[PDB]
């Protein structure tokens, strides 16, 4: 895929909306760049639900056009939260091709190949600096057809370089939708 990022609010715009809970900005894209007062990460939409990590969003609401959106799901055990995706949010379709060519999308819009090693693991084709993957948790992993395989959760690191990635597999996002 090709990928590009667009900024849509600044530092202060972000704190304020955080307090009000009310966001009237127009929402486009499958991948949202998200922020709390103290940290930033990613959210990805699949099946009309906007998904991200628990260690990121915790139990927080999502600022939205009719005020604070409550979480539809909060699964601490799997590091998974999801809100009803805000209008304009594009959804990815779940991957069904059991492919092992995966591509992580990061907050910088790099798409980096990852070799699948298990249902929720892949190794980075080239290791990366931890600093470069920080803040991309909640980003998607894509198969060569550009479907969602899962969302970025953790990296496995030897001394500061990430060597592999953990992600929430999409079957378990569907499961939690019962």
């Amino acid at each position: 895929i090709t990928a590009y990022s667009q900024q849509t609010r600044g530092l202060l715009g972000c704190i304020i909306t955080s307090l009000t809970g009310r966001d009237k900005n127009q929402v486009e894209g499958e991948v949202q760049v998200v922020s709390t007062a103290t940290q930033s990460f990613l959210a990805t939409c699949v099946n009309g639900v906007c998904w991200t990590v628990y260690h990121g969003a915790g139990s927080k609401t999502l600022a939205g056009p009719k005020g604070p959106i409550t979480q539809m799901y909060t699964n601490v055990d799997q590091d998974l939260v999801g809100w009803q995706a805000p209008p304009g949010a594009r959804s990815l379709t779940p991957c069904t091709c059991g492919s092992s060519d995966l591509y992580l999308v990061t907050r910088h819009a790099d798409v980096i190949p990852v070799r699948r090693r298990g249902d929720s693991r892949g190794s980075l084709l080239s290791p990366r600096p931890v600093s470069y993957l920080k803040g991309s948790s909640g980003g998607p992993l894509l198969c060569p057809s550009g479907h969602a395989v899962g969302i970025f959760r953790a990296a496995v690191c030897t001394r500061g370089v990430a060597k592999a990635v953990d992600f929430v597999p999409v079957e378990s996002m569907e499961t939690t939708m019962r």
Binding site: A3, T8, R9, S18, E30, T36, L62, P86
Partner: peptide, 12 residues
């Protein structure tokens, strides 16, 4: 108790 806020997007 505060909210998560959308501050940008990655377009694919």
């Amino acid at each position: 108790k505060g909210s998560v806020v959308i501050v940008g997007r990655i377009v694919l």
